[PDB]
Structure formats: structure tokens, C-alpha cells
Amino acid sequence: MGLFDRIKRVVSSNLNDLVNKAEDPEKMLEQAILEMQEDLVQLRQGVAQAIAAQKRSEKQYNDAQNEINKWQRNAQLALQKGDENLARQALERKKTYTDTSAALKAS
Amino acid sequence: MGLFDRIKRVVSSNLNDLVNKAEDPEKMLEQAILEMQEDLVQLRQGVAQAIAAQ
Amino acid sequence: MGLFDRIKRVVSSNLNDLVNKAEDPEKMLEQAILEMQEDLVQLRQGVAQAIAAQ
Amino acid sequence: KRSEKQYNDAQNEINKWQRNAQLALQKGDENLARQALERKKTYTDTSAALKAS
Amino acid sequence: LDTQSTQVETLKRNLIQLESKISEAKTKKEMLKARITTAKAQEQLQGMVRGMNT
Amino acid sequence: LDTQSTQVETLKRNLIQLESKISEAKTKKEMLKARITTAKAQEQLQGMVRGMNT
Amino acid sequence: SSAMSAFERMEEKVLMQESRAQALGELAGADLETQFAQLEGGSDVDDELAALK
Amino acid sequence: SSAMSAFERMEEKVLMQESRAQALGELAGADLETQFAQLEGGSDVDDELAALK
């Protein structure tokens, strides 16, 4: 009801003014800084988390990229006994890990 | 409610200033050192534990 | 119903996070060791039983 | 005049550590002298910071 | 046995590919979750344009 | 008896390997628990960059 | 497995925790050149290593 | 037969169970060369056997 609307707006217009009465300009500004700083802390925490996630996902790519050569080393150590199936499977796994490394490097 | 938000911020802005009033620059700095040292003790305890585990 | 599926997934995504909240890294690792050791005991009991049967 | 104490210690130590490294390598050990160099670099950075202060 | 060898190798390729997919998907999950965490507070904190409160 | 001898030796190898695994895993558990204990206090104590409180 | 899914979870938790711990400093820093000097001592340490060695 | 059809069934069940148990590791593995080294010790064990023998 319009009656209820207008009576409610009438009751708000007194609390609003008591609140404006107990306002102090200097002292009040302090919160406008404290809360800004706190939520800034939260935001930079999120920034740090993103940084850390990237620096962690770099781990698998580093493993795979050094492995792109460790697998050649394994294939060499295998063929040094004269076996070609082991070196060939090492090549296949190296190709798999190289594709993984390429995807992870793009990421 | 916006009313409640603003009334609460109004009540905080007085406790905050009483706290800033009972602040003493020299004397206050002491805790900033004591607690740093205590948590430093904790950190070095952890360092020692890692050393010992190895 | 898709409605029921999505409402259920919504309710799980809060219990899951409360559980992740009451997680403590050090203290938690203890069970990962205790239960491993207990089932290791069971496995070696079976090994002993095979030995004894032979 | 008190904070000058640590800087004096570290600056004389920037050479006492070379002395220790020499006394160590005089037996033919290089790890001890190398760790002496590392600690000397640490104490030299400390000395530089303290001298700026 | 040769036929089953072909089958198991084509089943080995299957699983490798799908494990790679789920792993990369989890990587994207983490990066996007970080994205969300940035945004959530970000929208409470932005430039102080004089013509809005927000 | 020879067949069971093969079985018990292949069961001896099993258990040795799995005991080695659980033992190395416990070693990693301890080292990582030390890691955690370092980190926990470490993040309350870091450089005093003038542009943050944290 | 139960005891094996608990282990891997806390392991990844450890990894992320250490990554954050390093990130805080990695996020902060006196200056990019100060960050690089912290990473690597510079010509001074190389010269000291060569001379003592 | 009844008692003989129960026996054979559980026997084949045993066989499949052990095959799976070995498959889990056979399915997993640190590296194909690591798998082969696990299968066979390598030149080191042969040399040790020859020397001690």
C-alpha cells in the first residue's frame, strides 16, 4: 500500500538523519582507509595465488622438457646393449612427453 | 541494510580513535620487536627440525 | 532430473569446502602413515600365512 | 655508536674470513675455504647494509 | 594374442590421451579458480571515479 | 613344493618392494612435514616491504 | 585408494603452500635489479670464488 | 559336478584376481626403462654375481 510506502519512507528519514548527526569528518575517514587496505590485502593474496599456480605448473613443463632429452639418454643407454625395441618405445614415450611439454609450454 | 552498515561504520570510527589515542610511539614499538623475535624463534625451531630430519 | 542433479552438485560444493577448511597439513599427514602401516601389517600377515602353508 | 659495533665486526671479518680460508686451504681442503667465502659474502652484504645505515 | 595386443595398445593410447586431457583440464581449473579469486575482490576495489560509489 | 617356492619368492619380492615403498614414503612424509612447519610461520614473517602490512 | 588419496592430496597441498610462501617474496621486492641480485650475487661473488680458488 | 564346478570357478577367479594385482603395477610405472630395470637388474647384478661366484 501507498500508505505503507509513505509511512516507511517517513520512518527512514529520521534514522538517516540521526546517522548523519553522529558523523564526524576526520574520524570517519579512517575506516574508508582501513577497509580499503584490508580488501587490498585480499586482492594481492589472490594475485600471489595466481603467480604461485603458474610457478607450480611450470614444474611439469620443466620435467617434460628436461625429459625430452633424458629419454634420448635412456634410448642411447638401451641401444648400447643392442636392443632396438626399448629405444623405440623410449622414442614413442619421448614423443608423448614432448607433445605434453608443448601443450604445457603454450599453457 | 544500508542503515545498519552506516550506523556500524559510525560506531567503529570512535573505538578506532580511542585506540589511536592510547597509542604511545616509543612504548608501542616494543611489541613490534618482541613478537617478531618470538615467531623468529618458532621459525628457527622448524629449521632445526628439518635439519634434524635430514 | 537436471534440476535435481544441479541442486545436488550445488549442495556438495559446500560440504566439500567446509571439509577442505578443517584440513591441517601437518596433522593430516599422520593418518596417511598410520593406515598405510596398518594395511602393511595385514599384507605381511598374508605373506607369513603363505610361507607357513608352504 | 653501538650499531657501529656490528659493522666494525663485519668489516674486520671481511678479512678475517680470507684469513680463515687461507688457514683452511693451507691443509689442501677447498670446501672449507669455499664455505668461508660464502659466509664472507654474507657478512660483506651485512656490512654494506650496516655501513649504509 | 596379437589381436589383443593391438587392442591393448589402442586401449593404452586411449587412456594416455584421456589422462592428459583430465590433467590439462585440472591445470586450467586451478588457473581459472585463481582468476575467480582475483575477480571476486577486484570488483569491490577499483578506481575512485568521482561519479559513482558502487 | 617347487611351485610354492617360486610363489613364496615372488611373494618375498612383493613385500620387500612394498616395505621399501612405505618406508621411503614415510621419509618423504617427515621431510614434507618439516617443510610445512617452516612455511606455516614463514608466511607470518617475511621482508618488511614498506608498501604492505600483511 | 583411501590412505593413498589422503597422501597425494596433502602432498599437493604442501606443494601449493611452498609455492605461495615463495610467491610472497617473489610478489614483493625492493627493485627488479634487487630481485636479480638476490637471485645471483653478481660479478663480485664470481671474482671472489676465482681468487680464493 | 557341483563341488567340482565351485572349485574351478573360484580357481579362475583367483587367476584373474592375481592378474589384476600384477596389472596395476604393470599399468603404472615410473618409466619404461624403470619398468625394465625392475624386471631385470642389469649389468650391475650380473657383474656382482660373476665376481662373488
Residue numbers in the entry:
A (entry chain A): 1 to 107
B (entry chain A), C (entry chain A): 1 to 54
D (entry chain A): 55 to 107
E (entry chain A), F (entry chain A): 108 to 161
G (entry chain A), H (entry chain A): 162 to 214
Authors' description from the paper:
It assembles planar sheets as well as 3D rings and helical polymers, all implicated in mitigating plastid-associated membrane stress. Given that two-dimensional (2D) planar sheets share a close geometric relationship with helical lattices, and as a means of understanding the interconnectedness of Vipp1 polymers including rings, spirals and planar sheets, we determined the structure of four Vipp1 helical filaments by cryo-EM.
Specifically, Vipp1 and a Vipp1 interface 3 mutant, Vipp1-F197K/L200K1, were assembled using equivalent helical parameters and lattices and were termed Vipp1L1 and Vipp1F197K/L200K_L1, respectively. Although the Fourier transforms of Vipp1L1 and Vipp1Δα6_L2 class averages were similar with closely related lattices, only helical parameters with a rise of 2.37 Å and a rotation of −75.86° yielded a Vipp1L1 map at an overall resolution of 3.7 Å. Map local resolution range was wider than other Vipp1 helical forms with the inner parts of the filament well resolved compared with the periphery, where the hairpin tips and helix α5 were more poorly ordered. The Vipp1L1 subunit was built between amino acids 1–214 and assembled using similar interfaces as for Vipp1Δα6_L2 and Vipp1Δα6_L3. Specifically, the left-handed 21-start helix in Vipp1Δα6_L2 and Vipp1Δα6_L3 that runs nearly parallel to the helix axis formed a 19-start helix in Vipp1L1.
